[PDB]
């Protein structure tokens, strides 16, 4: 696609999130860069309002699937880059099993040469000492498959997957992700055949950062089509 | 529990009553399945005369309980978990730039036989199109079948898109929208997202005079390592 | 390659095997056809000397990897078809764990319009009541991955895999295959990057056939490369 | 295996390399940690002798496959951890297409609580303005599959793969790796069935480091067995 | 060992070599017999492709150490016979000082009643008028000690020695041999304590043979252990 | 060599060892003299920290192969003396079968008129009541051959032998020695052809010595070369 | 010695024996060549009077120790070459245990460019169906050490050794050799320190020889002195 | 049988009465031997004052039963086979360009002690020579000792040549002609030809005031593999 050509090199990224979970308001700013040729993202996030009222790992999926590596044989199935530079709207509901949910709306688009992800997040019905508000999630992340299908009627895609968050007591907290993406602009986009994205994420800390933060490195690669 | 019913070879019966643009037909099928290998062998006969649509368009309609689920994925096999009482399988199949089939099937054990009984209604097909005009080649491609849980119906939703090769080198797409729900009250396994990789071989019985199809299938689950 | 073009349609196949296992001599003829477009083979084999003295499943791998389906994005890695029409020599040693071995040499080439596989097999050091000579293998077949690497110095490939043959008592008999393929002709061939073939095999009987025989249907598909 | 238990949490790593390429002597020290539960490694390497005389990417593979993530259903095929704590010797020849070669010998073993990789490297026959000694490689890294087979007769494994190194003009420099691994200790070790490791590597710089160095983050996951 | 029994009398030997030195292709066939009771071998070799492109003495070591005489008090240290009848793989690099090198791989095993040595040889980097390709070696052969050590970690032995080849001007061409031997079979084999083989070789011609050939008589005796 | 001339008479020797075996720290000082003309050494060792925590015989090989007698016809093969006065580094790993290992590093060099051997030894993975830490070795010593080969790439030698330590119950404890020696200085050294040293060692006690000590007399003679 | 220089190349040999054992008269002629540089002899012997009345192996020692290889460090101890060209007289008594004896006198000397060994042999007191006259010796030969000492009073040497002749029933026939050698000429000869000669002999047949004969290849090397 | 007497450490006593060119002297020696290692430790004292010849000339005179015979050569150990009753050892030792020693010794067990009692007569030595002039260095070379059977005396003959280094860099040779015969009537082992490899270390006791020699010896049989 024409939007594909915008990602042949390193692209700076900005992320902005305004959140409210059970009435706890917070903001996070992020910055870094992405290199879609390698399916690679590096980002640092800072909670600019103080301490984050939810565990950092619960927000990883919310904080730019346009950086996925689509192998050459699958390039016609990359909806995300096709919607650029005008961008897309990404909406999710994230159901934490036996706990509350996040609802998010994001616009992902170029502002000049920068890929910007601007998100509003609302979380409701969390338990005060559940795994989320009780901060019982480990600072780690598993690998996942993200399943994509076309939604022709909305000129976009429907995406579903279930994140497994490790708990400090050896158990797992599930987070079921229902997602839809729709183009912001009116130009042609690529609607894909069913496929998935294989994801890997490394969470870390900046040793010289005193603010509540998260350093994130991700690799994402599309797979599942040979026709 | 339902798993135990598939450790060996299981006989299969298939019965389809169809109506496509008013053309009424019936097909009977028989054979056997071996879920240990994800393998099916089936022979289908049109008992009403000539089949008014191409045999390949009906392959998906004519028992995903015979899929091989490798040991590490056994908690994700909905299809067997619903046995012996069975499941209802419903689809809409949209043929791009042409009509659609709508199917409803019950798949369950009748005695020691796994039986697939189907009703099929096809509408809005073009008389000159790929389907009624019989322009599909007698072959079949390999596909991935994507499965998700539908927790509120206590079943699954399934989606995939069949690519049917046309006699001129083009491809006719058949977009499948599928739902399966248990017939009985027993517990079933609701899976994490995954897919089935499918391969199908179509052939003819050289001594069969009636309009028919011999089908061999291999189906294997994949996509989960957690 | 140019050889690739010989496989765009249905191609007739002939197979001829001259065998000697522990001194028991036998011959098998096979015929059928292959459709590389779908990675599909259909063959029927007859023991023309009487009872086959080894189990049919032990000979499946011996009885035309040129019929593998290579997806379009892997087509420069198909050695097998690139060697045609002149063909290739396929040599194996097959080590049956805790038992004897087969050594095979085969020429696979076009003879007119027909792909012909002519094989000589010698088996030695088999146990008179082990799984092979005691006919304790079930008449079935598992799915395998066949690992392929280039062997530049021999202008061919090196291939390795281990067949799992189910035994009648619920155990498995392994058969470790060491394989080499080298072109017969002097024309250039395609030497592949590392990849594998995913194989499925269905064994059955012809209800009209009174001789000792095996009907085989195979699907074979290359995978493992996206660069 | 028993060795597997040594890798359930974060394990400190030290790396020491003594190298000589076309008579250019150099030493690199590395340190960091691995979390085999996630198939994740984080390492920083410093050339302690001055400027590295070869490109940092050509040394990535030389600089602890015991940190690979083996999924539960493949844990019987993890040779690397089963050899611990006594370790294994890893030997390679790396052939750079149209250029010279590296030969390496490394001992990877626990020394106290730390997993130590001590390497000797000798490179010969490099072109003085080839892609390697002329520093023409990009500071980036592709994803690869690493193919592993047992070599029971030699009490170890054989490993083969071909690194694709991106070159500054858009071409690729191939680096064909021939690798053998052998236990150091006498205890029982697992010899695997054929499989592969899927690798991803992120190279970066430490903004506070004035010496010649490389920061490396890797993810490695085992795949290819369902039996 | 059990294999030792196979060598109590005269054993027929066949040797086949396929070689390529600096691109010069050649084949040699050999035949004769060994009497390990006396540490004695008698062999005749013929170059079946015409003139041998290297001197016959440089191939003496390549052309069945299972015929060595081990005195009664050292019979626990005879790896070579203990690997029979299934055999061993013998791999060498032979470095000719100031010239090129041979790399060989050979399987030495019984095929029926005959001990067969099947070899592939590749030589590279030879000087076109060096001592080897310029045929400057005398048709004679010195006595040598062949030093054997166990390599238990690799299920075999390591062997090293340096042949002194007399040159037509009175000097000597050194040929440094690095050798590894590994059992082919899975049964138990003897791994020896350190010792050596004392070798003597007599080269001659068959007065009735018009082709390029070598007649070889060898005596080999194990020594160096009294514990 | 020039170093050879430093050994024509009686030379004073000093030995200093800093040891740690399973965390038990200890130190040994030795003194005496060597007469390389006769291949003879006389040394007395004292544990200056109290009781030696390992048996004295296990340290014999650790406590100056420059005193070996090389017959006149083998004098160009004496690496040890050729490295003097600047000296050589001697490193070993000594593997006690079914028990732990010693790793040693020693500098052997002239300090004024005295040949000094300074050693650091680290032992690990010893069994608390195995033959070593349980003091089950007899106070005696067998005769051994020490196998020497050149290691041209390290400008030194590689050495291997296996000590047989008699145990109090009539059994033997093996100690497999892997040894490397490399010159300290840059001057040329003599790199030998393969040969061995024949060693005899006599252990005794000084009847006037109350501390834990060992008196050692050694004879060492090179052999194996007549070319 | 001056006589040493006569043996630097290949020297033709003639042997003539007239024998009488228990009254059975026979003659043997032999011819071939020797290469003392390699300690190597090749000879063919024919019984010119018909069938040999004693086994061929009993005469091997009787049928030119001047062809021994004396290593450079032992050259002053080679009496045999020192007595040339005038030669020496070799006298033996050979006692066959539990049987008769041979007494021999030989002159070994140059006649022109040929080294000639002319022998008279008388055998007495053999049993008619002992191992010798009964022809119960196997056609093979073991390796031996030949022990040499000076006999100053006779200006020559005294030699002793005991040949082990294998019998067809698995036993051994001993032949105790008492030998003296004295110079024929009056020029200076080298009288040796005690040493020995290590011997190896291969007996064979000429396939195109119809007469009763023996083909003999020998290797002899002096050893035992390093001073 | 005699073999069994040497499996452990055995105490040794040596007594020599000598007369060299009329100079009478006596030496007593003691220590122990360990034939398992071929190893001897001995201390000798001249009890009559100064030894009138160099200590190194007497080393060979001052118990080859302590030689190590490796297991494969055990049928060739005459010396042990003659124990406990013992053997007579006689030698003539010819010092090149000088005099000779003639010795006769009995070597046998006396109780649990192996005792070597020797008579030594030396004649025709030069007063200014290497021996009486004391010009031999206090050291010793390694030698091979050649043994043959003497079937008709039911013993052995032994020959070798000692090289004694002189204070000026030259060497004094001492050619040994030796014969051993059993004292008792018991059977002995008559060996095939072989040799003993010898090493000797001479030293002084720093507290001993009398004229003396401390000797450590290693002796190993070799030369037979049949």
Domain containing residue D9? 1-227
B149 interfacial to chain A (CB closer than 8 Å) = no
Residue H81 distance to chain E (closest CA, Å): 21
Is residue D139 within 8 angstroms of chain A, CB to CB?
no
**How many Cα atoms occupy the beta-carbon half-sphere of G73 within 13 Å?**
15
* Structure determined via: X-ray
Total structural domains within chain F: 1
- CA D66 vs. chain centroid, Å, equals 10
Q: Distance between CA atoms of G9 and G30, rounded to whole angstroms?
A: 20
CA–CA separation, C13 and C6 (whole Å):
13
- Count of A-C CB contacts under 8 Å: 13
Residues β-bridged to residue B166:
B136
Distance from CA of D74 to the nearest CA of B (A): 10
**What kind and span of H or E run contains D82?**
helix D79-82
- Which chain E residue has the Cα nearest residue F177? E194
Report d(CA F157, CA E159) in Å as an integer.
16
Residues of B with CB below 8 A from A227's CB? 141, 163
Residue by residue, DSSP assigns chain F as --GGGGGSS-EEEEEEEEEEETTEEEEEEEEEEEETTTTEEEEEEEETTSS-SS-GGGGTTT--GGGPBPPGGGGGG-HHHHTTTT-EEEEEEEEETTS-EEEEEEEEEEETTEEEEEEEEEEES--TTSTTTTT-B-S----EEEEEEEEGGGTEEEEEEEEEEEBTTS-EEEEEEEEEEEESSSS--PPPPSEEEEEEEEEE--TT--SSEEEEEEEEEEES---
Q: What is the chain B residue with the closest CA to D73?
A: B72
Contact residues on chain E for G42, CB-CB shorter than 8 A: 202, 204
Residues of G whose CB is below 8 A from F72? 73
Q: Are D38 and A142 in contact (CB under 8 A)?
A: yes
- B138 part of contact set with chain C, CB < 8 Å: no
B197 contact partners, CB below 8 Å, separation of at least 6: B142, B143, B144, B145, B219, B220, B221, B222
Report the phi/psi class of residue E87: left, alpha or beta, with left for phi > 0 and alpha for psi in -120 to 50. left
Cβ count near B50 (within 10 Å)? 10
Resolution attained, angstroms: 1.9
Across the interface, do H218 and F200 touch by the CB < 8 Å criterion?
Answer: yes
Closest CB from A38, A217, A221 relative to D140: A38
- Chosen from C41, C143, C197 to mutate, greatest number of chain B CBs within 10 A: C143
CB H65 within 8 Å of CB H6: yes
Please, which contacts does A39-42 make with residues 24 or more away whose CB atoms are closer than 8 Å? A39/A67, A39/A68, A39/A69, A39/A219, A39/A220, A39/A221, A39/D143, A40/A67, A40/A69, A40/A217, A40/A218, A40/A219, A40/D202, A41/A13, A41/A67, A41/A216, A41/A217, A41/A218, A41/A219, A41/A220, A42/A216, A42/A217, A42/D202, A42/D204
Maximum distance among all Cα pairs of chain A, rounded to whole angstroms: 50
Q: Would the CB atoms of B203 and C42 count as touching at under 8 Å?
A: yes
Q: How big is chain C, counted in residues?
A: 227
Cross-chain Cβ contact H193/G164 below 8 Å = no
By C-alpha distance, the chain C residue nearest D198 is C224
Residues of C in contact with D98 (CB under 8 A): none
Return the number of other C-beta atoms located less than 10 Å from residue E169's C-beta.
8
Distance between first and last Cα of chain F: 18
In 3D space, the residue among D168, D215, D192 whose CA is nearest the CA of residue D32 turns out to be: D215
Q: Which of H141, H146, H163 sits opposite G194 (nearest CB)?
A: H146
Instruction: Please judge whether F227 and E164 are an interchain contact, meaning their C-beta atoms are less than 8 angstroms apart.
Output: yes
The gap between the terminal CA atoms of chain B, to the nearest Å, is: 22
- Sign of the torsion formed by the C-alpha atoms of C77, C78, C80 and C83: negative
Contact B226 A193 (CB under 8 A): no
To the nearest whole Å, the CA of A183 is away from the closest chain B CA by 23
Q: What are phi and psi of F211, to 5 degrees?
A: -75, 165
Residue B136 phi, psi (nearest 5): -85, 135
Do D154 and E152 count as a contact with CB atoms less than 8 A apart? no
| CB proximity list for G60: less than 8 A, separation 6 or greater | G141, G163, G201, G203, G216
Q: How far is F170 from chain G (nearest CA, A)?
A: 34
Question: Is G72 within 8 Å of F73 when comparing Cβ atoms?
Answer: yes
E30 touches chain D (CB under 8 A): no
**CATH code (residue F177):** 2.40.155.10
Q: Say yes or no for a CB contact (<8 Å) between B223 and A196.
A: yes
d(CA D207, CA H182) in angstroms, rounded, equals 91
The β-bridge relationship of strands F156-166 and E195-204 is unpaired
Residues 6+ apart with CB under 8 A from A186: none
CB pairs under 8 A between F and H: 34
Record: contact F149-E145, CB cut-off 8 A: no
**Quick check: H159 contacting G, CB < 8 Å?**
yes
Residue G132 DSSP class: T
The Cα of E170 is separated from the nearest Cα of chain F by a number of Å equal to 14
Nearest Cα neighbor of G68 from G45, G91, G35, G108 is G35
Of E152, E153, E184, which has the smallest distance from its Cβ to D153's Cβ? E184
CA distance A212 to E104: 63
Total residue count of chain H as it appears in this document: 226
Choose, out of C149, C194, C195, the residue to mutate when testing the contact with D (most D CBs < 10 Å): C194
Which of E182, E91, C102 is closest to D152 using CA atoms? Answer: E182
E170-175 long-range contacts, Cβ below 8 Å, gap at least 24?
Answer: E173/E96, E173/E97, E173/E99, E173/E131, E173/E132, E173/E136, E173/E137, E174/E96, E174/E97, E175/E58, E175/E61, E175/E94, E175/E95, E175/E96, E175/E97
| Distance of residue E142 Cα from the nearest chain G Cα, in angstroms | 7
Residue pair F133/F127 in contact by the 8 Å Cβ criterion: yes
**CA separation, residue G186 to residues G2, G85, H153 (Å):** 14, 12, 36
Length of chain A: 227
E140/chain G closest Cα distance in angstroms: 9
Residues G174-185 as b/e (b if ≥16 CB within 10 A, e otherwise) read ebbbebbbbbee
Beta-carbon separation of E194 and F147 below 8 A: yes
The C-alpha atoms of residue C40 and residue C216 are separated, in whole angstroms, by 11
Chain centre distance of CA F102: 13
Contacts of C34 in chain B (CB under 8 A): none
D156 touches chain E (CB under 8 A): yes
Pairwise CA distance, residues E72 & D24, whole Å = 52
Q: How far is the alpha carbon of F218 from chain H, nearest alpha carbon, in Å? A: 10
Strands (E), D50-128: 88-96, 101-111, 114-124
* CA-angle at F28, arms to F23 and F30, nearest 5°: 160
The residues with which E93 forms a beta bridge, in sequence order, are E103, E178
Mutate to test the interface with E, among F194, F195, F197, F198 (most CBs of E within 10 A): F194
- How far apart are alpha carbons A100 and A124 in whole angstroms? 6
Rounded to a whole number of angstroms, the distance between the first and last alpha carbons of chain E is 18
Which residues 64-93 of chain C have a CB within 8 Å of chain A?
71-73
d(C-alpha E38, C-alpha F221), whole Å: 31
Closest chain A residue to C221, measured at CA: A226
Q: CB–CB of A212/A46 below 8 Å?
A: yes
Q: What is the 3-state secondary structure (H, E, C) of chain C?
A: CCHHHHHCCCEEEEEEEEEEECCEEEEEEEEEEEECCCCEEEEEEEECCCCCCCCHHHHCCCCCHHHCECCHHHHHHCHHHHCCCCCEEEEEEEEECCCCEEEEEEEEEEECCEEEEEEEEEEECCCCCCCCCCCCECCCCCCEEEEEEEEHHHCEEEEEEEEEEEECCCCEEEEEEEEEEEECCCCCCCCCCCEEEEEEEEEECCCCCCCCEEEEEEEEEEECCCC
Q: Identify the H or E element spanning G119.
A: strand G114-124
G158 contacts: CB under 8 Å, gap ≥ 6: G148, G149, G150, G151, G179, G180
Residues in chain A closer than 8 A to B160 (CB atoms):
194
Q: Is E104 exposed, middle or buried (0-12, 13-18, 19+ CB in 10 A)?
A: buried
Q: Are C187 and C215 in contact (CB under 8 A)?
A: no
Closest chain G residue to H197, measured at CA: G224
């Amino acid at each position: 696609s024409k939007g594909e050509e915008l990602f042949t090199g390193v692209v700076p990224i900005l992320v902005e999130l305004d959140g409210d979970v059970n009435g706890h308001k917070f903001s996070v700013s992020g910055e870094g860069e992405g290199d879609a040729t390698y399916g690679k993202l590096t980002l640092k996030f800072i909670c600019t309002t103080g301490k984050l009222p939810v565990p950092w790992p619960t927000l990883v999926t919310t904080f730019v699937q346009c950086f996925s590596r689509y192998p050459d044989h699958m390039k016609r199935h990359d909806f995300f880059k096709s919607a650029m530079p005008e961008g897309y709207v990404q909406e999710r509901t994230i159901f934490f099993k036996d706990d509350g949910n996040y609802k998010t709306r994001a616009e992902v688009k170029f502002e000049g040469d920068t890929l910007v992800n601007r998100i509003e997040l609302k979380g409701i019905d969390f338990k005060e000492d559940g795994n989320i508000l009780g901060h019982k999630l480990e600072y780690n992340y598993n690998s996942h498959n993200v399943y994509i299908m076309a939604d022709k009627q909305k000129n976009g895609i429907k995406v579903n997957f279930k994140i497994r968050h490790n708990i400090e007591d050896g158990s797992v907290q599930l987070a079921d992700h229902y997602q839809q993406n729709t183009p912001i602009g009116d130009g042609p986009v690529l609607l894909p055949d069913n496929h998935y994205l294989s994801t890997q994420s490394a969470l870390s800390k900046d040793p010289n950062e005193k603010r509540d933060h998260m350093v994130l490195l991700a690799f994402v690669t599309a797979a599942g089509i040979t026709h």
